[PDB]
Design goal:
Main location: secreted
Helix content: 25-40%
Distance between the termini: 21 Å
Radius of gyration: 14 Å
Largest sheet: 3 strands, antiparallel
Number of domains: 1
CATH class: Mainly Alpha
Organism: Gallus gallus (Chicken)
CATH topology: Lysozyme
Strand content: 5-15%
Order of helices and strands: HHEEEHH
Strand order of the largest sheet: 1-2-3
Keywords: Allergen, Antimicrobial, Bacteriolytic enzyme, Disulfide bond, Glycosidase, Hydrolase, Secreted, Signal
Number of strands: 3
Subcellular location: Secreted
Number of helices: 4
Pfam families: Lys
Shape: globular
Structural class: mainly alpha
Amino acid sequence: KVFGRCELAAAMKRHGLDNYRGYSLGNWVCAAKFESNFNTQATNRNTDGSTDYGILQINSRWWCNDGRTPGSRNLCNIPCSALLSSDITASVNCAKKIVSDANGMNAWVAWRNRCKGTDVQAWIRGCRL
């Protein structure tokens, strides 16, 4: 499912991401935009053999099990396919654990490089929230 900007903002808010660990909703929407382009079905393989899954491109080396990442840890306790669902609940719950780690949102390279320090409020402007 390819989300609409305001649609995704509302689902993210509902799920409790607005200001989770200090990050305003604009950040999460911006990160989804540049990580997956609002597509829940996005996958990207990395050089180390791991793969990123879903709307927030969660990595298989540490967070989920895809059965093909030697040494994976599966910290979110879920098969990576669960992150491709049109229902973003799994992605959100796992993202909540990732951002709680020492590095915060810097865990998402797209956020660090394209959202960090920008007017992220723009991502939710015009939305009925």
